[PDB]
Symmetry: C3
Subunit: 213 residues, 3 copies
């Protein structure tokens, strides 16, 4: 369609890890985003799981130009339009539907939607998509399930999210079908609550360095 100035592939290839951010207090959003950027992680998935999420996207979009901020847990076109208005550069959804795929592909920012099954992958491909989230990765059957799901589809690429942490993320990054992974461990709720931005920066840098090799 030509509609997306930012490609979905560019979002997934910026770096190896995309943090799944749950931010309860708005005041934490900008220092958190700066702390991630300082650790070399700069694609920020702010999930629509808290009241302040869209305001957090808006603030990060304005105040942290070194980050590419987007929205996650986007379930429907209403939410897609909200995050587009607020300054999200991309949208992540935990699964897909036709109204969401239609609104996204007609709209101005890339959607990287989750799938669990090949039928869901095929419906996304019918809308021209080739980059997907694999969610919930561990509950979908992990690396092996992803290897089987990805096999008939040489060209498709994934961002697995759900149950991924330093213990297992390399297993996913090793796969030819995987561009990057998502996880909430880079932004733990207790770190945000305690204002331990220093620890967020270290978690980010540990993730980036640990992804190599």
């Amino acid at each position: 369609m030509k509609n997306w100035k930012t490609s979905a592939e560019s979002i997934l290839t910026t770096g190896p890890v995309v943090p799944v951010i749950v931010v309860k207090k708005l005041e934490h959003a900008v220092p958190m985003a700066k702390a991630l950027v300082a650790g070399g992680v700069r694609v920020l998935n702010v999930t629509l799981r808290t009241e302040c999420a869209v305001d957090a996207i808006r603030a990060i979009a304005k105040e942290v130009p070194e980050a590419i901020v987007g929205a996650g847990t986007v379930l429907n076109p209403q939410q897609l339009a909200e995050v587009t208005e607020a300054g999200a550069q991309f949208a992540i959804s935990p699964g897909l539907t036709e109204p969401l795929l239609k609104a996204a592909t007609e709209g101005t920012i890339p959607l990287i939607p989750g799938i669990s099954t090949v039928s869901e992958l095929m419906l996304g491909m019918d809308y021209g998509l080739k980059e997907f989230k694999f969610f919930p990765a561990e509950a979908n059957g992990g690396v092996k399930a992803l290897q089987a799901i990805a096999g008939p589809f040489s060209q498709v690429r994934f961002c697995p999210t759900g149950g991924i942490s330093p213990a297992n993320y390399r297993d996913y990054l090793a796969l030819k079908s995987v561009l990057c992974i998502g996880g909430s461990w880079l932004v733990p709720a207790d770190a945000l609550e305690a204002g331990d931005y220093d620890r967020i920066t270290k978690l980010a840098r540990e993730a980036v360095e640990g992804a190599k090799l």
Copy 2:
């Protein structure tokens, strides 16, 4: 809530912790089985559309055991939904969902609690305004862990897991914030039903309700 439904789907699931999955082969067993379950404290009766007499069983239970909340399970399309609604079903359960079934349900008069296995299926149900779902088949879907992850991004949705749930594991599911109740076939064993062993059915229902307590 759904403007066309007089009974909410939520109220169906919050009635009790266990919903028996009923397969009734011979019509004459349906009413005494329903009374036996009610007598054991279990009144939401999922009469599955897996046998020829299922719809007549729903009608019989609706007439003779009006204190039960009788409904239909294994509802696969709008035709079956209309048929069970006409018969007196107070709700419908489906093992999975489709857009024609969702549309017919929301235009019709009784709550549908449809099965999902994945978040995309959940999202399709949510597009139609639904917030109460079955999680089927629960154990083969990846059980409590799967359900935990799937239900994660979806804090308002509630489930009734069904499929491989037993007295051995049902409290594992009932302990989850996202779960209101579970479904199981163990309350109405095929052999008890054919034997007319209603005291056994009552005992099992009573044990299920007591054992659900955390």
Copy 3:
């Protein structure tokens, strides 16, 4: 179906095993097919995963008329029409979509489409289909899923494919709802390279003989 002279059920009941074929070099297609047929395996799922696949289907159709040759990894109506014109006698898809289901039921050859979940099964049944692939079987929950996924659906029948080999194919073939299984083990990539047609015939013969319950 009055549009499908060759029923989906006839394809799946021909034998216990359907090889998932990836043919990288066209010249190997015909002797591979003859080797399978010599070992007693006649239904050949030639997957659309390599450039020469459609030419492989045309070659096998001409030269090995006892092979029942079909196309796999059929993802959309365009590919379905292409393989139909090339002489495929059936099509297999790893999942399903409404455009693919509509095209299949409008066309002349049976589609046996993959499902992973009951909602996907219900969508296929809404188009009148009663035979399905269960893919990727191991990732879908395996035998326990079919005892359960197939539960409320006593009449539906399957061809499980994905992670099935001699170690477990009998576990699937034991099920009332299973007509046959699929797998790539019968045509190992390196056997084709090495021109080891004897190896292919032996694996086929072993698979058919090992299937007797």
